[PDB]
Every structure is written in C-alpha cells, then in structure tokens.
Ligand SMILES: Nc1nc2c(ncn2[C@@H]2O[C@H](COP(=O)(O)OP(=O)(O)OP(=O)(O)O)[C@@H](O)[C@H]2O)c(=O)[nH]1
C-alpha cells in the first residue's frame with residue numbers, strides 16, 4: 001500500500017500537534033511548541049505519513065522545503081484567535097500560491113470551535129477570501145470545524161484527506 005505524505009501547517013498554537021495526538025492516542029496529551037518536524041505514520045486501508053511542521057514565525061520559512069512530496073495539505077487555524085486571523089490568512093495564501101504544490105487538495109481545519117468567540121465556517125471563508133475562485137484554480141478544498149482537545153470533527157477531517165488520496 002502506497003505512502004502519502006500529508007503536510008500539517010498553520011500558525012503556532014493553532015492545535016496541529018493536539019490534532020495529531022488525538023489521531024493516534026485518542027487523548028489530550030501535553031504539547032510543546034514544535035520547533036522541527038514531528039512525523040507520524042497513520043493507517044486509515046491506506047497508510048499516510050503525516051508531517052506536523054512547526055508554526056513559530058522564524059520556522060514558517062521552512063514549510064516550502066519541508067513539505068516536498070506532500071499529496072495533501074492540512075492548514076490548521078485557531079478559530080477563536082481573531083487578532084491573528086490576518087496572519088493565518090497570509091500564510092494560507094503563501095501555501096496556495098506556492099508553485100511547488102498547485103494540485104494538492106487543501107483541508108482547512110477550523111480548530112478551537114469550543115472557545116467563546118470562535119469563527120464560523122462562513123466567517124473563515126469570508127476573511128480568507130476563499131470565495132474568490134480566480135486565484136484557486138482546479139484545487140479541491142474543504143473546511144472542517146474541530147475541537148482537537150476532544151477530537152470533535154478530527155476523524156471527519158482525516159476521512160476527507162483519506163478520500164482525496166484514494167482518488
Ligand atoms: N480550547 C481549545 N484548545 C485547543 C484546541 N486545540 C488545541 N488547543 C490548545 O492550544 C494549544 C496549542 O496546541 P498545539 O497542538 O501545541 O499547537 P501547535 O499548532 O502544534 O503549535 P506549534 O507547535 O508551535 O506549531 C495547547 O494549549 C492546546 O491544548 C481546541 O480545539 N480547543
């Protein structure tokens with residue numbers, strides 16, 4: 001069975017590692033800010049090699065090179081962090097416009113839906129400008145609201161990625 005590299009990117013503290021811990025242990029374990037790459041190999045009947053990249057500012061510049069070979073991209077966002085939503089939109093578009101990954105399906109994980117003031121799926125599409133097809137081309141995209149600490153929507157997020165790789 002073929003291995004498919006999945007890249008997990010997003011700003012620091014978005015909940016990337018929290019999501020990957022749930023995908024494996026089904027539990028909320030303590031996390032440390034990822035300053036490197038934490039690679040987990042999961043099987044959901046296709047095995048994928050998920051690369052949880054670090055989201056700290058001075059590490060984001062490495063995403064372009066570290067994602068080499070990814071078949072799908074998961075961009076995790078902190079839905080409750082309205083003060084850093086312009087910063088996440090800027091990073092999401094840097095990935096979308098990266099000429100190295102133009103055909104890769106993009107799953108946008110709207111994490112932290114439990115927090116008060118969390119943005120809705122509609123609100124995220126509007127702020128991120130994803131309602132403009134011109135700069136999106138023939139790329140398949142999907143938004144999945146999650147609470148990574150409880151795993152709410154996390155199995156449904158990985159099912160979309162798996163469905164995309166099956167194609
Ligand atoms: N309330 C709430 N907290 C969450 C959620 N997901 C993650 N967190 C918390 O958010 C913080 C950051 O989570 P991490 O998984 O370490 O974030 P990260 O994306 O890996 O960050 P970097 O490693 O620095 O890129 C932790 O305190 C988590 O427990 C969620 O859905 N709801």
Ligand SMILES: [Mg+2]
Nearest residue numbers: 017032033034
């Ligand atoms: Mg991390």
